Amino acid sequence: ASQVRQNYHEDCEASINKQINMELYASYVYLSMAYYFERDDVALPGFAKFFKESSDEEREHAQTFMKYQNKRGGRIVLQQIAAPSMQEWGTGLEALQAALDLEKQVNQSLLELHSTASGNNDPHLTKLLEDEYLEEQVDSIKKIGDMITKLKRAGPHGLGEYMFDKELN
Amino acid sequence: ASQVRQNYHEDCEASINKQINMELYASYVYLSMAYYFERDDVALPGFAKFFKESSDEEREHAQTFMKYQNKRGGRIVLQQIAAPSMQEWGTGLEALQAALDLEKQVNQSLLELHSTASGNNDPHLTKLLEDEYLEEQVDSIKKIGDMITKLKRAGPHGLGEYMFDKELN
Amino acid sequence: ASQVRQNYHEDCEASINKQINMELYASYVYLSMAYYFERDDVALPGFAKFFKESSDEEREHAQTFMKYQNKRGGRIVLQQIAAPSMQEWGTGLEALQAALDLEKQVNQSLLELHSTASGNNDPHLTKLLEDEYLEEQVDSIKKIGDMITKLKRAGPHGLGEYMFDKELN
Amino acid sequence: ASQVRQNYHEDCEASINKQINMELYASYVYLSMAYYFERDDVALPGFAKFFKESSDEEREHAQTFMKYQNKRGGRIVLQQIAAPSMQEWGTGLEALQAALDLEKQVNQSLLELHSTASGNNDPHLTKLLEDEYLEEQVDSIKKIGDMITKLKRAGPHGLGEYMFDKELN
Numbered sequence: 001a002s003q004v005r006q007n008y009h010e011d012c013e014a015s016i017n018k019q020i021n022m023e024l025y026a027s028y029v030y031l032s033m034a035y036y037f038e039r040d041d042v043a044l045p046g047f048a049k050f051f052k053e054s055s056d057e058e059r060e061h062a063q064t065f066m067k068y069q070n071k072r073g074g075r076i077v078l079q080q081i082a083a084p085s086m087q088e089w090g091t092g093l094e095a096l097q098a099a100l101d102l103e104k105q106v107n108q109s110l111l112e113l114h115s116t117a118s119g120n121n122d123p124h125l126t127k128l129l130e131d132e133y134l135e136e137q138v139d140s141i142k143k144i145g146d147m148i149t150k151l152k153r154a155g156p157h158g159l160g161e162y163m164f165d166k167e168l169n
Numbered sequence: 170a171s172q173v174r175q176n177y178h179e180d181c182e183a184s185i186n187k188q189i190n191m192e193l194y195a196s197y198v199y200l201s202m203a204y205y206f207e208r209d210d211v212a213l214p215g216f217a218k219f220f221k222e223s224s225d226e227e228r229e230h231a232q233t234f235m236k237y238q239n240k241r242g243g244r245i246v247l248q249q250i251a252a253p254s255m256q257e258w259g260t261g262l263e264a265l266q267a268a269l270d271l272e273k274q275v276n277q278s279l280l281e282l283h284s285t286a287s288g289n290n291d292p293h294l295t296k297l298l299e300d301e302y303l304e305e306q307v308d309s310i311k312k313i314g315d316m317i318t319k320l321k322r323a324g325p326h327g328l329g330e331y332m333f334d335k336e337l338n
Numbered sequence: 339a340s341q342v343r344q345n346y347h348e349d350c351e352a353s354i355n356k357q358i359n360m361e362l363y364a365s366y367v368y369l370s371m372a373y374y375f376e377r378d379d380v381a382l383p384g385f386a387k388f389f390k391e392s393s394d395e396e397r398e399h400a401q402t403f404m405k406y407q408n409k410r411g412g413r414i415v416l417q418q419i420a421a422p423s424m425q426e427w428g429t430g431l432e433a434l435q436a437a438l439d440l441e442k443q444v445n446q447s448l449l450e451l452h453s454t455a456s457g458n459n460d461p462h463l464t465k466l467l468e469d470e471y472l473e474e475q476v477d478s479i480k481k482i483g484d485m486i487t488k489l490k491r492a493g494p495h496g497l498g499e500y501m502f503d504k505e506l507n
Numbered sequence: 508a509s510q511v512r513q514n515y516h517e518d519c520e521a522s523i524n525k526q527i528n529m530e531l532y533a534s535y536v537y538l539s540m541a542y543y544f545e546r547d548d549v550a551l552p553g554f555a556k557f558f559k560e561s562s563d564e565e566r567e568h569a570q571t572f573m574k575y576q577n578k579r580g581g582r583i584v585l586q587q588i589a590a591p592s593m594q595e596w597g598t599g600l601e602a603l604q605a606a607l608d609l610e611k612q613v614n615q616s617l618l619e620l621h622s623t624a625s626g627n628n629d630p631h632l633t634k635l636l637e638d639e640y641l642e643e644q645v646d647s648i649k650k651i652g653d654m655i656t657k658l659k660r661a662g663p664h665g666l667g668e669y670m671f672d673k674e675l676n
Binding site: 002003004006007070071072073121123124126127 | 607611614615618621622625633636637638641642645646648649652655
């Protein structure tokens, strides 16, 4: 084993690898969305910007997990990153609905991983999950909820979609 | 011939002259639009500003071609600049539709001139077209497309036309 | 078709989509390398930094192509990103050898795409390839060659690998 | 009992006292090493500096635990600090091997103390351990692992030891 490894269970190691794949998947989904919103026939720069930032963030999370794996003396195993579920994401509202649903799946996975970490008595890993993942995830989910409500109020189509988009830019 | 002229075919020289006429025509059309949008009964200052800038840009392009003609040792032959197709341009949307058709005709003409230049093996002229004309043209066509989509979303009439006009100003 | 599309052949559109997949694949390979070199049992921070930068660069290239596709009025089709060929990359020297083969495959693909674009008479696309892709690719291949020679001189193992690693950091 | 004491079990109190002794022991070991490396017949200033800093850090940790004991209304009981295991630490590599092994014993003890804290439902103490001890310990262990690998690559004797030492200075 690694000269550094201590109190680091193989299931926690494997589950972090799955989490890295998942964060990269989400990055990729958001990148799809970001550029869908720069189509000449879509043209929503605020949504574009929002998803571009989200793509970058999810990539940073994957990287934090890669760094963590190495830190504990685990070994990073990288898998294929699936194509995003869609090529076209419909309205702004629909894209946010899909992001909300995605963010919650990621959150579910993070909580499962917390539970595995707790059952294996790994308080270094529960603390990482709490400080670096679970708080962010909760803020994100709140923010997207807020956005969805604001957009349904403003629009969610036509002028209201146009105006809401400006608040994101 | 000119003491400077080298590898500069007369068809490329004549085609540049046509192109100067065309850029000046486009300048003039945009000038018409610019001031149509400062009519008391129209009053769209953002559209006005956008077409005033476009009119200036197209005059600069014409001038760049005049300068190029002289660089190569060609001789500038200036023709009549036609009256614009219209005196009144309708809605903001309609004016943008007309700019889009105009920008595309200009693009087609630039590509024809590129093709004449490649067939006459003149890489100095193909490079000019790529660097100074074809790129700006493509960005400009993208930009107008985006604008048209944004305006159809926002308006394209009434409150939406009024708000969209503000993002241009 | 798109309101913006002009002189943009479907084969060039499809080939750009392949190219985006390829640049993202390369990004991913370099990400793998970057973090392989932060393993406690590897510990080559200069190599790590070099491949982390390369991973970022290749993601930016992919994004530039996504943006280009939209500029031209094409439609971005995102595919599965394959797992990297390896999980462990051996020595610094071996990793650079693999980057060199990778950079060259990418170059070959960019040249094929240039050739498709010239055969379809699309000088806007040949210009993009020359300005934004082919030049960086050639510099990058030169740079990696230089690095390989420098590392073979210095090391390529032991004290020499350690010192060479410092010039990258 | 102390006017402040709440939810603070006597076993957690006693175990913190043992932890204070241990941190001071480690400080002392590192101080030994720090000055072994300023012997005229050793002369490794980077290793000297590294261990001097580590000595200071471990003393600060002991002090943080002293402050914590008082904070919860426990009573600090200070014991003799054992002589370090050795008077001479051999090569730089050997000293780092011994530090790695020491850091892991401290880490084991910290995790035992976390477990005692969890079993006594003391989330104030689990949180202290997570934020102020366990993260530091893990970073430290990673860093020393990295160092060991870098030194085995560079040297671990002769010129390579000399050069590696300069990276620590």
